[PDB]
Design a binder for this molecule. Structure first.
Ligand SMILES: O=C(O)c1c(Cl)cccc1Oc1ccc(F)cc1
Length: 164
């Protein structure tokens, strides 16, 4: 299977590692195509969205040993139908910023064992699995990381390719 469409989507991308707190919220985000974060990281992502042809979120639930997929921002965050996230301990829906609409590019998992050869120059050349929530990943490392994920037959890139 050709990777030309995915390489096109990634040509001028920025990449951010999302260290999700709860697997259930990743499931919600996957199903509904929406995501939200704290205003600190939100502002950084809204700026990125204006700065690059694609902004890619690469999800890795904390302590999971895996990435759970990756998605492209379709919009800057907006404030809308409320999403009922599973709120982690000591968190409240008030702490969250607006909602990003996101188009999932892959919803299949990638174990850290499969990315162990990739290092992120923008995180001190550490293996790319290592990073805080919102860690930016350099273009080539991010591109290669996305290309390691298995093909996802539930995904059709047509809508993304049209939004571009
Ligand atoms: O990381 C998640 O589980 C998560 C996701 Cl995927 C989407 C939306 C919210 C999430 O959790 C939070 C809930 C409230 C907060 F104030 C901060 C994070």
């Amino acid at each position: 299977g050709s990777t030309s469409k995915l390489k096109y989507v990634l040509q001028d991308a920025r990449f951010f590692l999302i260290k999700s707190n709860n697997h259930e919220n990743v499931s919600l985000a996957k199903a509904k195509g929406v995501w939200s974060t704290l205003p600190v990281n939100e502002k950084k992502l809204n700026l990125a969205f204006r700065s690059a042809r694609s902004v890619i979120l690469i999800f890795s639930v904390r302590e999971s040993g895996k990435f759970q997929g990756f998605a492209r921002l379709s919009s800057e965050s907006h404030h809308g139908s409320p999403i009922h996230w599973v709120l982690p301990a000591g968190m409240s829906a008030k702490m969250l910023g607006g909602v990003f609409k996101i188009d999932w590019i892959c919803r299949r998992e990638l174990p850290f064992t499969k990315s162990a050869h990739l290092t992120n120059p923008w995180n001190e050349h550490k293996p790319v699995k290592i990073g805080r929530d919102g860690q930016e990943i350099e273009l080539e490392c991010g591109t290669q990381l996305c290309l390691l994920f298995p093909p996802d037959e539930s995904i059709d890139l047509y809508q993304v390719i049209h939004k571009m």
